[PDB]
């Protein structure tokens, strides 16, 4: 099971993508833990899948951000409800498909980028990163093998899809 | 720089290994004064792993190189030079590029030997590949914290994962 390889640890994907997204917004995330392995080709592919996902729903991401900012005290709980819902959203395939994985990291990276534009929100960036990583980590553990999904297959499909938008 | 670890030695051993793996024997292989080193056996493994990952591409690269009029040697030099000058924030001659160049070069050497008409250019292949890597390796490794010992350690670990 390639998703069990320390090189492919979910934390790595989240940190890399979040860092990448923030930079795309003209900023330098100087509080991002390091990549104890360096950038991997799979992270490279995630950056693309995430970019394509965002562009496809740029308007909605903006509206989602606005609705989250409307919650009293701008609590982190509603964001967990978002994440949890995506994971528990029914299907006859993997509860944590490549699509949901990508959607969660793409939306999470977008939110991270916006939150960094506000000092008042920067503290909660640790929550965002940690929670997103731990949630996805658990769901892959109890879903990928059964529904025969893997990073190799992910890469196989990702390349072909990156080509269509290229 | 232990004479035992001379770059030309790595190229010769790997090229010889790959040619023999193709069912043949390289009778033009210069000698390795110090014999087969453990660093050489590791390069053999890394090279094999590398080729298996990109076997199909290696095949295509060969075909494209054979489509160059007169089957000139310069386009291959363009390949090698391009790899060394690709750009990076690390060692221009990282273990990956070293393995890639020796693995592809060995693949090409094995294919060339299957053709008496191309055998003469095998000398160009190994002399040039060795010299290019040599000129590139130090004045470039001792400043990017890269060494054979480190190559061996990382390589040992990677080898095990692939051996299940």
């Amino acid at each position: 099971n390639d998703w069990e390889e320390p090189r492919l640890d979910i934390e790595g994907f989240v940190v890399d993508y979040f860092t990448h997204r923030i930079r795309q917004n003209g900023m330098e995330w100087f509080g991002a833990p390091g990549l104890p392995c360096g950038v991997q080709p799979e992270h490279e592919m995630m950056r693309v899948m995430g970019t394509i996902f965002e562009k496809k729903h740029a308007e909605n991401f903006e509206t989602f951000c606005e609705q989250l900012l409307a919650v009293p005290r701008i609590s982190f709980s509603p964001y967990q409800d978002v994440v949890r819902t995506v994971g528990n959203a029914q299907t006859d395939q993997c509860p944590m498909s490549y699509g949901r994985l990508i959607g969660l990291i793409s939306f999470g990276g977008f939110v991270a980028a916006k939150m960094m534009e506000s000092v008042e929100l920067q503290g909660q960036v640790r929550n965002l990163f940690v929670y997103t990583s731990l949630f996805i980590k658990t769901r892959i553990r109890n879903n990928w093998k059964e529904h025969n999904r893997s990073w190799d297959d992910f890469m196989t499909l990702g390349k072909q899809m990156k080509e269509d938008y290229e | 720089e232990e004479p035992r670890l001379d770059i030309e030695g790595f190229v010769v051993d790997y090229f010889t290994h790959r040619i023999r793996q193709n069912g043949m024997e390289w009778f033009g292989a210069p000698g390795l004064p110090c014999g087969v080193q453990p660093e050489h056996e590791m390069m053999r493994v890394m090279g094999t792993i590398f080729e298996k990952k990109h076997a199909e591409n290696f095949e295509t690269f060969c075909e494209q190189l054979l489509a160059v009029p007169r089957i000139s040697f310069s386009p291959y030099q363009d390949v090698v030079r391009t790899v060394g000058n690709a750009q990076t924030d690390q060692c221009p001659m990282s273990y990956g590029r070293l393995i890639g160049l020796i693995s592809f070069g060995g693949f090409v050497a094995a294919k060339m030997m299957e053709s008496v008409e191309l055998q003469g250019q095998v000398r160009n292949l190994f002399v040039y590949t060795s010299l290019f890597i040599k000129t590139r390796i130090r004045n470039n490794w001792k400043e990017h914290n890269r060494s054979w010992d480190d190559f061996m350690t990382l390589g040992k670990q990677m080898k095990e994962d692939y051996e299940r």
């Binding site: 320390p6 090189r7 | 363009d78 390949v79 990956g96 890639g100 990677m158």
Partner: peptide, 29 residues
């Protein structure tokens, strides 16, 4: 030619991908 440059560009990417992976074992402690 020009083919050597493009073949080289691909080899370099493949090479860097291999290096990245191999360099992830320098990831323990």
């Amino acid at each position: 030619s020009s083919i050597g440059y493009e073949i080289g560009s691909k080899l370099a990417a493949m090479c860097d991908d291999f290096d990245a992976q191999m360099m992830s074992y320098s990831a323990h402690a």
